[PDB]
Amino acid sequence: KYLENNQYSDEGIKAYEFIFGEDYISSGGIIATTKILSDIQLDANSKVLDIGSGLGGGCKYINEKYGAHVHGVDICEKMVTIAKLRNQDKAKIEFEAKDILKKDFPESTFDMIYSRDSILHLSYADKKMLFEKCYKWLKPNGILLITDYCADKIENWDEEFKAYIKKRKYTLMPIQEYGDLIKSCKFQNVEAKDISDYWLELLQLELSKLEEKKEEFLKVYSIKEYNSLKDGWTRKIKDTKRDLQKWGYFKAQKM
Ligand SMILES: C[S@@+](CC[C@H](N)C(=O)[O-])C[C@H]1O[C@@H](n2cnc3c(N)ncnc32)[C@H](O)[C@@H]1O
């Protein structure tokens, strides 16, 4: 019976940047981004869409690494304003505040559509609608590259996990089911992989760095935000170990 700040509350966004690192508000920050993109091929003429672009870290990284044009879409105007402010000097990056479900792009626009821990905000029906849109928006041979939270079957959920999902308003499904949804939208070369052991390593590292810097955190943020972060990572670590909360990797191609 308490009022909990929502995930992207003013303080929540700042706290996520503290734990994930500057410009990022999802798993593994720049470290995971480097790894996820380590076999991805793009150049200065490539066009990339980032679905759920947040504070802009991913767009910044992709443009810096490849020189690619990057277009980030995020439903949160406040984040889009931040991303724009921080990347004014990058002419080939643009950000737009919109619900991706209300976006259209022409057929064959993007060499890559990229999304990191954002599609969890969408209902199953909306995920399907989005993947149908993504299929259209990709160029021939274009790549869809996603990480997203996934979960064990609902009957294996316990009380705390259910409370977490409700609070966050997430819609989480198992990895195979997510891959099958992508396949059903005609994507080919579909890879749907459980990378929860790598997620575990990132969670452990993130928490260890938070605890190391507790005094630093407490100079600017609340001890309630501190314990909320700490307890939240503690639960994610526990729940990934028993295969309840999962991290999914999905790569697919339009052929
Ligand atoms: C966990 S954050 C990750 C952001 C960024 N990809 C990152 O890794 O730092 C998920 C993002 O999804 C965005 N989002 C949620 N629903 C959306 C929608 N319908 N359209 C576009 N973005 C959405 C949120 O505003 C949030 O910034």
Longest dimension (CA), the chain: 53
154/156 Cα distance (integer angstroms): 5
Q: Separation of 25 CA from ligand 1 center, angstroms?
A: 9
**Structural domain count, the chain:** 1
**Nominal resolution (angstroms):** 1.5
Alpha helices in the chain (DSSP H): 10-20, 29-36, 57-66, 77-86, 124-137, 159-168, 175-184, 196-212, 214-220, 223-241
The answer, yes or no, to whether any atom of ligand 1 lies below 6 A from the CB of 24, is yes
Closest-lying ligand 1 atom to the alpha carbon of residue 103: 20
User: Could you list the residue range(s) of the whole structural domain that residue 132 is in?
Assistant: 1-255
The two counts, helices (H) then strands (E), for the chain are: 10, 7
**Closest Cα to atom 8 of ligand 1:** 26
Q: What is the CATH number of the domain that holds 86?
A: 3.40.50.150
The CB-side HSE value for 133 (13 A sphere, CA atoms) comes to: 16
Q: Which residues are annotated as a binding site for S-adenosyl-L-methionine?
A: 25-26, 74, 99-100
174/151 Cα distance (integer angstroms): 5
Method: X-ray
By most ligand atoms within 8 Å of CB, the mutation choice from 27, 74, 78 for ligand 1 is 74
Angle at 206 between CA 2 and CA 159, to 5 degrees: 40
**Closest Cα to atom 25 of ligand 1:** 76
